[PDB]
Design a protein around this ligand. Structure first.
Ligand code: MG
Ligand code: MG
Ligand code: MG
Ligand code: MG
Ligand code: MG
Ligand code: MG
Ligand code: MG
Ligand code: MG
Lengths: 117, 151, 55, 56
RNA sequence: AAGGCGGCCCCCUGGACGAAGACUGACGCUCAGGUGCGAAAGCGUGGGGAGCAAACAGGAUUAGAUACCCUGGUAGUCCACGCCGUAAACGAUGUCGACUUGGAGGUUGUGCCCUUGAGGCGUGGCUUCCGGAGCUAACGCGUUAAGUCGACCGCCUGGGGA
């Protein structure tokens, strides 16, 4: 609909899932897509292939605004940390800046108990 | 094949045109150890294929095999309990070995009158890349390009 | 001999991300790697030095 | 880790330079570490065990 | 001292160690009784409550699952003042003192030698690994002794019962 061209690619890659959100330089959401929403579950959900198809679906629902250049921002671990960025460049984008924004406390909150498995 | 690093058996070339690649194909179509009734179906499907495509019996098979020839395949590997498909690039000798195998097996699943017809029409459907033989390469391409991260 | 004010000398003992660099990599004496951190922290407070590569 | 893509530099190299900037900083190292709580007796045990291992 | 103690800054304060001399003149060691300190949980009153999480509820797993896993979650964890006085409170080694080959480090003082944007030689305090004599049932310990001696105190006397 409107024009933007330069934006920000935001990705929340967690051990369970990967959320791909395409936003502008200010922080306003343009469009999004996730691995869970892509039509995968459990095991298939937390794979780099699912993170690949999420970036593919995301680029489609946003090219109506007409984006050409975007600076990637990586949050958290798990698969889809790299496979998202790859599926993004090969889809038709100029990657300006890749940044890791994984939240790291300076010893604050007590984390949950260790899983006895 | 743990310690023993073996080579490969170099089977005698074809009695007709002299190609070793065809001598492999006849051994693929051969069943119950009958070489006399195996090469007889392969030459009858070569004669009927070149006649209804425009001669060149050496090259009319070369058009049908390049389409069914794979470039990448997957290998099932249990790393941490889970089975991960690893994409591995196939060797030039094994490239044709699978391409020939998908022609014989797709023609076997056909409903034609004879194997001379089943094979000749399969080599015709693979030269235009619109059959069971080219699809087995297509599904092998979709599975290799999906697991492209664990390369 | 070490000071928080000397932000020039200090900028050599901190990473791309801002984190203080261990004595193992710096090859510094034990006594001073302490004096370093106290100063890096001191200057960090007085915004003569950052905390994170985000700001 | 902030990585700026340079002129005539490939996407392949810029990604590989970022993965090495993360490896340098301890991104996935601090995550697996802070995923669950570890008692002071448990970390004092790891610190003592890793000193024993740092004796070749 | 042990318990224990970790962002940065100030105020108050205890101990340790080194250099140089000066002063006191055995004022020392140890200690039943006694007195004080003493992790966590727990208790009382009053606040505080983000995260975590006994109990509890729900969802799963299972033959069952009053568990392990998941979703929630109360006490508690935090502050103040009181109480409790126990831990595998462990180096499972009481305190003090004297003596007895060595090797590589770590930390912290100080005496000196050099043209020094570092080292060279000593001399004290603490700490880690290996190891000699010796000791030990063996494992091991080994000048930070579990060696060789002395002073004093605690304690043991088959297992279950307890
Ligand atoms: Mg006198
Ligand atoms: Mg209370
Ligand atoms: Mg729970
Ligand atoms: Mg109560
Ligand atoms: Mg007791
Ligand atoms: Mg020893
Ligand atoms: Mg011995
Ligand atoms: Mg008894």
């Amino acid at each position: 609909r409107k024009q933007v061209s330069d934006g920000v690619a935001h990705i929340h890659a967690s051990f369970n899932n990967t959320i791909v959100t395409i936003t502008d330089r200010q922080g306003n959401a343009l469009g999004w897509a996730t691995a869970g929403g892509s039509g995968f579950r459990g095991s298939r959900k937390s794979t780099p292939f699912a993170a690949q198809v999420a970036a593919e679906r995301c680029a489609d629902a946003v090219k109506e605004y007409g984006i050409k250049n975007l600076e990637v921002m990586v949050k958290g671990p798990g698969p889809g940390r790299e496979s998202t960025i790859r599926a993004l460049n090969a889809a038709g984008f100029r990657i300006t800046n890749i940044t890791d924004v994984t939240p790291i406390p300076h010893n604050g909150c007590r984390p949950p108990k260790k899983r006895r498995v | 094949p743990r310690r023993r690093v073996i080579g490969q058996r170099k089977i005698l070339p074809d009695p007709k045109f002299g190609s070793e690649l065809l001598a492999k194909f006849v051994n693929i179509l051969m069943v119950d150890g009958k070489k006399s009734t195996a090469e007889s179906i392969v030459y009858s499907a070569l004669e009927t294929l070149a006649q209804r495509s425009g001669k060149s019996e050496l090259e009319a098979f070369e058009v049908a095999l390049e389409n069914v020839r794979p470039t990448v395949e997957v290998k099932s590997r249990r790393v941490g309990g889970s089975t991960y498909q690893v994409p591995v690039e196939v060797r030039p000798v094994r490239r044709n070995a699978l391409a020939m195998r998908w022609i014989v097996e797709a023609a076997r699943k056909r409903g034609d009158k004879s194997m001379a017809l089943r094979l000749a029409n399969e080599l015709s459907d693979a030269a235009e890349n619109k059959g069971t033989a080219v699809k087995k390469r297509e599904d092998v391409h979709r599975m290799a390009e999906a697991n492209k991260a664990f390369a | 001999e070490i000071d928080y004010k000397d932000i020039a000398t200090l900028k050599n003992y901190i990473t791309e991300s801002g984190k203080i660099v261990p004595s193992r990599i710096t090859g510094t004496r034990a006594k001073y790697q302490r004096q370093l951190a106290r100063a890096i922290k001191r200057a960090r407070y007085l915004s003569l030095l950052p905390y994170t590569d985000r700001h | 880790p902030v990585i700026k893509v340079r002129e005539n530099e490939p996407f392949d190299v810029a990604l590989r330079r970022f993965k090495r900037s993360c490896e340098k900083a301890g991104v996935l190292a601090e995550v697996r570490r802070r995923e669950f709580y570890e008692k002071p007796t448990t970390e004092r045990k790891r610190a003592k065990a890793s000193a024993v291992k740092r004796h070749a």
